[PDB]
Specification:
By secondary structure, this protein is of the alpha+beta class. The chain has a four-stranded antiparallel beta sheet. Strands 1-4-5 form a three-stranded antiparallel beta sheet. β4 and β5 form a beta hairpin. It starts with a helix and ends in an 8-residue tail after the last strand. It has one domain: P-30 Protein (Roll). The longest helix is centred in the first third of the chain and has 12 residues. The PDB classes it as hydrolase. Keywords: angiogenins, fish rnases, hydrolase. The assembly is monomeric. The entry is titled "The X-ray structure of zebrafish RNase1 from a new crystal form at pH 4.5".
Length: 126
């Protein structure tokens, strides 16, 4: 297990302090975070959520500001998030999303105090 590599990937996929719904496509695409579907070199993830908070604040969910939820951890306080859901396209640089801005109790996987995965809602694509 490489906790620090997974943490850095979690920053790239899920930490966006100034994100907005209008930025889903540009941020997920190859000119920025180049976020791709697991198991592919160029596929579109069906959903990716950005947490609109600083990484240090989000890391506290893995400490005292989180409570257990099965093999994951739920934030004790809600966080502002932008949820980007795949609307059309199946490969980069043409993955096009619809985004929703909301406030959610985020659910993460933590390893020795570091966040390494974001638990997304199941989604309907298209």
């Amino acid at each position: 297990m490489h906790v620090k590599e997974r943490y850095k990937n979690f920053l790239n996929q899920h930490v966006g302090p100034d994100m907005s719904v209008q930025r889903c496509n540009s941020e997920i695409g190859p000119n920025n975070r180049k976020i791709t579907l697991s198991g592919t070199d160029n596929g579109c993830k069906p959903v990716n959520t950005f947490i609109l908070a600083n990484k240090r604040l989000i890391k506290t969910v893995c400490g005292r500001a989180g409570s257990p939820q099965g093999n994951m951890v739920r934030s004790n306080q809600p966080f502002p998030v932008v949820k980007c859901v795949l609307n059309n396209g199946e490969r980069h640089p043409y993955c096009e999303y619809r985004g929703t801005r909301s406030t959610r109790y985020i659910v993460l996987k933590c390893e020795e105090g570091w966040p390494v995965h974001y638990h997304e809602d199941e989604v309907n694509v298209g």
